[PDB]
């Protein structure tokens, strides 16, 4: 829990003395609509009070809640207050200019051209920038050298470190599209990786993957899935990859929650065999909060919970996919914490899984993954990465982890 703080100010002749960014339709951080303090005006009320800081998140001012408001709504609320201003703020636990992007591109070029390659500098920069900032770096690099940064780094780097850095240079949709393409390489597929991506990505993420996949490979993702999978496993993967799950409605449909729970029990544990199309329809079409409540209501009817019912009712790839999907519905950060543990726990390392999760979740929910990991396994994700990887490859992964717990 981030620290929530109360700050009271007197509105001065020149206002409150700070600047805000963020808001619905004006995100200061990708995927985050919150209002953020971005400047403290010297001599103003905020500065003389001393508590408010850059990076603080505004939760409310007087009678106005500032969560999920547009930028203009926040401005109007903050400019039309009483003289007595009571701010509710949340403390954290970037001001990235073109100068920063150009300097990064220039320093990366120097690191590439250095004899023996200065991998340390390359890692220090790229693993400590957001995906959008890396995109800015890649465009600045191309403008300066007339060469693609990814191609230059492919030649300068090797091993698992090259895999990390080149994956970070792709947009989220490009990275997932190329990982899905790689998973379907050859007869059939790496079902584990296909399952991991298709079961964990949201509607919005899948919609962008579907578009970028077609642009990169000149074929639909759905057609490639169909060509390399079969049976009920194919049906489940195809249904999920469409990214047409019901969106989180504000109204909870309790009658449907009960009927879905009965239908899941009637389709499996209650009867000989399993009505797999019924399971597919319910678990791919209902919203995630709805299904969380369905899986709890299911326990009212069934002698086993949903995960145990899946193990007893189906087998093979279909069982694996359903088990991964239900974990993603119930607790996705815990799901990735478990896959990370499994990638490192035994002899060697499943670097393909370790790299993909660290690259793809570093900007999504890495803090929640780290929290679930430490709570379950007693040691930090940082520690397990330290014990299973070495050198600059380790340093890159540790930066994507973001810290020790």
């Amino acid at each position: 829990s981030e620290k929530i703080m109360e700050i009271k100010l007197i509105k001065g002749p020149k206002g409150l003395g700070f600047s805000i960014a963020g808001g619905v339709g004006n995100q200061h951080i990708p995927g985050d609509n919150s209002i953020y303090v971005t400047k403290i005006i010297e001599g103003g009320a905020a500065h003389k009070d001393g508590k408010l800081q850059i990076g603080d998140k505004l939760l409310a001012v007087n009678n106005v809640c500032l969560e999920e408001v547009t930028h203009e709504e926040a401005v109007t609320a903050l400019k039309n207050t009483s003289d007595f201003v009571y701010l509710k703020v949340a403390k954290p636990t970037s001001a990235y200019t073109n100068f920063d992007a150009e300097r990064d591109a220039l320093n990366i070029e120097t690191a590439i051209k250095t004899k023996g390659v200065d991998e340390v500098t390359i890692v220090n920069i790229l693993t400590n920038r957001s995906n959008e900032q890396r995109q800015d770096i890649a465009f600045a690099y191309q403008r300066r050298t007339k060469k693609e940064l990814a191609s230059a780094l492919k030649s300068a780097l090797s091993g698992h470190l090259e895999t990390v850095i080149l994956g970070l240079l792709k947009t989220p949709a490009q990275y997932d599209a190329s990982e899905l393409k790689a998973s379907m390489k050859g007869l059939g597929t790496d079902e584990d990786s296909l399952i991991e991506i298709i079961c964990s990505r949201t509607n919005q993420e899948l919609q962008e993957i579907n578009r970028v996949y077609k642009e990169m490979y000149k074929t639909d993702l759905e057609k490639d899935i169909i060509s390399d999978t079969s049976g009920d496993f194919r049906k489940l993967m195809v249904a999920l990859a469409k990214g047409r799950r019901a969106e989180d409605g504000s109204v909870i449909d309790y009658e449907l929650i009960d009927q879905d729970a009965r239908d899941l029990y009637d389709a499996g544990v209650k009867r000989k065999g399993t009505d797999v199309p019924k399971w597919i329809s319910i678990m791919t079409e209902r919203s995630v909060p709805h299904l969380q409540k369905v899986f709890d209501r299911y326990k009212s009817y069934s002698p086993y919970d949903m995960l145990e019912s899946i193990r007893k009712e189906v087998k093979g790839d279909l069982e694996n996919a359903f088990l991964n999907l239900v974990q993603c519905i119930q607790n996705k950060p815990l799901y990735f914490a478990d896959r990370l543990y499994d990638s490192m726990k035994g002899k060697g390392t499943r670097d393909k899984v370790l790299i993909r999760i660290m690259v793809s979740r570093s900007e999504v929910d890495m803090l929640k993954i780290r929290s679930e990991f430490k709570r379950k396994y007693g040691k930090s994700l940082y520690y397990y990465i330290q014990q299973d990887t070495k050198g600059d490859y380790q340093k890159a992964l540790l930066y994507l982890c973001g810290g020790d717990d």
Partner: peptide, 7 residues
């Protein structure tokens, strides 16, 4: 372009 506003 993103908006930043002084208050």
């Amino acid at each position: 372009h993103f908006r930043e506003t002084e208050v």
